[PDB]
Amino acid sequence: EPIVAAVLLIVVAVIGAVLVYLWFSGYVTRATSQAEQLSAAEQLKIEAVSKTGTTVSVNVRNVGEVPVKIASAYVLNATTLTMICGGSLTSPQQIDPGTIQTINVPGTCNLIAGARYIVKVVTARGTEAAATFISP
Amino acid sequence: EPIVAAVLLIVVAVIGAVLVYLWFSGYVTRATSQAEQLSAAEQLKIEAVSKTGTTVSVNVRNVGEVPVKIASAYVLNATTLTMICGGSLTSPQQIDPGTIQTINVPGTCNLIAGARYIVKVVTARGTEAAATFISP
Amino acid sequence: LTSPQQIDPGTIQTINVPGTCNLIAGARYIVKVVTARGTEAAATFISP
Amino acid sequence: EPIVAAVLLIVVAVIGAVLVYLWFSGYVTRATSQAEQLSAAEQLKIEAVSKTGTTVSVNVRNVGEVPVKIASAYVLNATTLTMICGGSLTSPQQIDPGTIQTINVPGTCNLIAGARYIVKVVTARGTEAAATFISP
Amino acid sequence: EPIVAAVLLIVVAVIGAVLVYLWFSGYVTRATSQAEQLSAAEQLKIEAVSKTGTTVSVNVRNVGEVPVKIASAYVLNATTLTMICGGSLTSPQQIDPGTIQTINVPGTCNLIAGARYIVKVVTARGTEAAATFISP
């Protein structure tokens, strides 16, 4: 009589094992592939900068193999990591691999000739690229 | 009765380990190969420059072993890192290793005789080569 | 593949990618081979 | 009848898992935070030394930002790593960040003019800072 | 009734864990020690070379502290890494620490007066030491 209960319990345990199998396969596949794709890296470099009046224009070179979106740009003060001007771009700019694009710092901020300034661009994914220039 | 459940759990763990091994092999191969192939570097050198009116012509020799494409050229001002003329070329030019090619700066920019100007050429992959010249 | 190719332990074999595909010189490509059991091995090369 | 035993065993397993969770949270917390706090590093530098008779006085400045206790001082012979005089200070001296204090080598040791000697001071935590001087 | 099966399963798991611990201790110890001992370094230096007729004699000094065996010697051509003469020695020669030994390049190879050559000696473990000479 307990044998019947044991058989039912074994069947229930097998069903639970199958359900664990299904969920575990789904989770391992999804999370594993998500981690694998986040393992990929994104690289940028800025070729040169130009200043016209009070507007700063930057040319960004996409040396990577994936499309790049530029979302913000700043003008950082030297050795203090404090921004003078910057913010969200009005519309994100897409940069194709092997191509170039022109980026303008949002807003208007004055500059002092012969002073230290760091121009910085950040991607939508978080990649950071920056360099220095001497304001005319 | 728990023995059957334990056997199913062991089987599930073994299958999960097999799937993890498959993905791990694929990912390690892809990542290792990408890193090894991007470890390679490219070198460029400019032989000489010439100016005809307001057009700048640059001869680039690729001392590397694999083809490299020229993407943009600039004429940089001294000690200020500010561009005067330049931008993306109309069509990229491919340079065969062991050969030479002539590149013209895009657009038209005036120059002042006896002044400092830095000629700069950037590859599609991001390699930079540059030098200086005296404007006639 | 038209017919599966068997590779003995400690030996080597030649495998041709099925079909015909054009390539671009100096471009990036990943070559990949998969076993009957599912094992994956791959690498990259620069097309001539 | 085995169903009741199975339910009790499941309850026992759940209670054991809860206990394991409690201990695991506690142990991870303490060990992790201990590792984080011992990860911090300490830096020292000695400004100048002076000799009065047979007493060696050293001024130590903590370029770091954490409180520091000086525990011992030595006078090491050149390239043989053998001490001539040194030992525990009578009472450890606390040197505040951004300040300096005077430390005297314990005991009395003679010196030879124009010879090589390395003065060495060690913190209570084990940080090592030293330099060389020529005895007058 | 499932309680007995659970107790037996726990006992089996404990035995398996003991076996895993035994193997793990053995493996970590022996593999770790083999790695530590291969971490050791081997250093050679050659004092001078001599030419008698068509035979090249090299004096090798053991600047290290461990016994070293010399197995082969070569004569490389300049800038091409191509051997002119060389091969396995008839019997490997042992060099004691702090001592010197004379090694003759195997075989007979002609040389040209005033020509460029590299003499090279390799140890049993793979250490490489070499220098240059001008043939008389």
User: Which residues does D contribute to its contact with B (CB < 8 Å)?
Assistant: 2, 6, 9
User: Which residues does B contribute to its contact with D (CB < 8 Å)?
Assistant: 1-2
Question: Closest by alpha carbon to D124, among D76, D84, D88, D85?
Answer: D88
Give residue A19's identity as a one-letter amino acid code: L
Neighbours of C (≥3 Cβ pairs closer than 8 A)?
B
Query: Which chain B residues contact residue C24 at CB under 8 A?
Result: none
User: Which residues does D contribute to its contact with A (CB < 8 Å)?
Assistant: 1-3, 6
CA distance B42 to chain C (A): 12
Query: Which chain E residues contact residue D1 at CB under 8 A?
Result: 1
User: Which residues does E contribute to its contact with D (CB < 8 Å)?
Assistant: 1-3, 6
Tokens of A115: 């002073």
Query: Which chain B residues contact residue C25 at CB under 8 A?
Result: 67
CA distance A83 to chain D (A): 27
- Rounded Cα distance between E20 and E5, Å, is 22
Q: In what order do the strands lie in the sheet with E45-52?
A: E45-52, E55-61, E100-104
Record: contact C39-B25, CB cut-off 8 A = yes
Record: contact B74-A98, CB cut-off 8 A = no
CA distance C6 to chain B (A): 20
Query: Which chain A residues contact residue B74 at CB under 8 A?
Result: 47-48
Neighbours of D (≥3 Cβ pairs closer than 8 A)?
A, B, E
- Chains C and B contact (Cβ–Cβ under 8 Å for 3 or more pairs): yes
* Distant-in-sequence, close-in-space partners of B123: CB < 8 Å, separation ≥ 6: B42, B44, B68, B69, B70, B71
Query: Which chain B residues contact residue C38 at CB under 8 A?
Result: 22
Give the distance between the most distant pair of CA atoms in chain A: 96
Tokens of B43: 């070198």
Contacts 24+ apart (CB under 8 A), E96-100: E96/E62, E96/E67, E97/E62, E97/E64, E97/E65, E97/E66, E97/E67, E97/E68, E98/E62, E98/E65, E99/E61, E99/E62, E100/E47, E100/E59, E100/E60, E100/E61, E100/E62
| Residue of chain B with shortest Cα separation from D3 | B1
- Rounded Cα distance between B134 and B118, Å, is 9
Instruction: Report the residue of A59, A60, A111, A118 to disrupt the B interface, i.e. the one with the largest count of B CBs within 10 Å.
Output: A59
Question: Closest by alpha carbon to B1, among A8, A70, D17?
Answer: A8
Cβ distance B78 to B30 under 8 Å?
Answer: no
Record: contact A9-D2, CB cut-off 8 A = yes
- Rounded Cα distance between D48 and D69, Å, is 19
- Rounded Cα distance between E46 and E100, Å, is 9
Residue with tokens 């074999």: C13
Cβ distance E89 to E106 under 8 Å?
Answer: yes
Residue A67 is classified by DSSP as -
Question: Closest by alpha carbon to A71, among A120, A125, A123?
Answer: A123
Record: contact E1-D5, CB cut-off 8 A = yes
User: Where do the H-state alpha helices sit in chain D?
Assistant: 2-38
Distances (CA, A) of B112 to B54, B85, D116: 10, 13, 63
Give the distance between the most distant pair of CA atoms in chain E: 96
Which SS3 state, helix, strand or coil, does residue D100 take? strand
Tally B–C CB contacts below 8 A. Answer: 27
| Residue of chain E with shortest Cα separation from B4 | E5
Tokens of D135: 């005895």
CA dihedral E102→E103→E108→E110, nearest 10 degrees, is: -70
Cβ distance B118 to B131 under 8 Å?
Answer: yes
CA distance C21 to chain B (A): 21
Cβ distance A55 to A111 under 8 Å?
Answer: no
| Residue of chain D with shortest Cα separation from B2 | D6
Q: Element (H or E) spanning E38, and its range?
A: helix E2-38
Cβ distance A111 to A54 under 8 Å?
Answer: yes
Tally A–D CB contacts below 8 A. Answer: 9
Q: In what order do the strands lie in the sheet with B83-95?
A: B83-95, B68-77, B116-123, B128-134
CA distance D72 to chain E (A): 34
Contacts 24+ apart (CB under 8 A), C25-29: C25/B67, C26/B66, C26/B67, C28/A65, C28/B37
Tokens of D71: 């525990």
Q: What is the resolution of this structure in A?
A: 4.3
Question: Closest by alpha carbon to E3, among B112, D3, D63?
Answer: D3
Distances (CA, A) of B55 to B59, B112, B120, E44: 13, 13, 15, 60
* Distant-in-sequence, close-in-space partners of C20: CB < 8 Å, separation ≥ 6: none
Instruction: Report the residue of E4, E9, E11 to disrupt the B interface, i.e. the one with the largest count of B CBs within 10 Å.
Output: E9
Q: What is the 3-state secondary structure (H, E, C) of A3-50?
A: HHHHHHHHHHHHHHHHHHHHHHHHHHHHHHHHHHHHCCCCCCEEEEEE
- Rounded Cα distance between B98 and B91, Å, is 22
Which SS3 state, helix, strand or coil, does residue D110 take? coil
Tally B–D CB contacts below 8 A. Answer: 3
Which SS3 state, helix, strand or coil, does residue B110 take? coil
- Rounded Cα distance between B107 and B85, Å, is 7
- Rounded Cα distance between B71 and A70, Å, is 20
- Rounded Cα distance between B117 and B48, Å, is 14
The experimental technique behind this entry is cryo-EM
Tokens of A62: 């996409």
Q: Element (H or E) spanning B95, and its range?
A: strand B83-95
Give residue E95's identity as a one-letter amino acid code: I
Distances (CA, A) of B12 to A7, A97, B18: 21, 43, 10
* Distant-in-sequence, close-in-space partners of B32: CB < 8 Å, separation ≥ 6: none
Cβ distance B70 to B57 under 8 Å?
Answer: no
| Residue of chain B with shortest Cα separation from C27 | B67
Give residue B113's identity as a one-letter amino acid code: A
Which of C25, C26, C42 is closest, CB to CB, to B29? C42
CA angle E4, E10, E12 (to 5 degrees): 105
Question: Sign of dihedral through CA atoms E125, E126, E132, E133?
Answer: positive
* Distant-in-sequence, close-in-space partners of E114: CB < 8 Å, separation ≥ 6: E134, E135
Question: Closest by alpha carbon to A58, among B48, E67, B82?
Answer: B82
* Distant-in-sequence, close-in-space partners of A11: CB < 8 Å, separation ≥ 6: none
User: Which residues does A contribute to its contact with D (CB < 8 Å)?
Assistant: 2, 5-6, 9
Phi–psi pair at B12, nearest 5 degrees: -60, -45
Give residue E16's identity as a one-letter amino acid code: G
Cβ distance B124 to B41 under 8 Å?
Answer: no
- Rounded Cα distance between A125 and B1, Å, is 52
Record: contact B67-C30, CB cut-off 8 A = no
Question: Sign of dihedral through CA atoms B68, B73, B75, B78?
Answer: negative
CA distance D1 to chain A (A): 6
Cβ distance D5 to E6 under 8 Å?
Answer: no
Question: Sign of dihedral through CA atoms B7, B13, B14, B16?
Answer: positive
- Rounded Cα distance between B123 and A63, Å, is 9
- Rounded Cα distance between E1 and A5, Å, is 12
Cβ distance B105 to B85 under 8 Å?
Answer: yes
CA distance A85 to chain B (A): 19
Question: Closest by alpha carbon to E120, among E71, E79, E80?
Answer: E71
CA distance B15 to chain E (A): 20
CA distance D38 to chain E (A): 26
Cβ distance E87 to E108 under 8 Å?
Answer: no
Cβ distance A116 to A82 under 8 Å?
Answer: no
Query: Which chain A residues contact residue B5 at CB under 8 A?
Result: 10, 13-14, 16-17
Cβ distance B50 to B57 under 8 Å?
Answer: yes
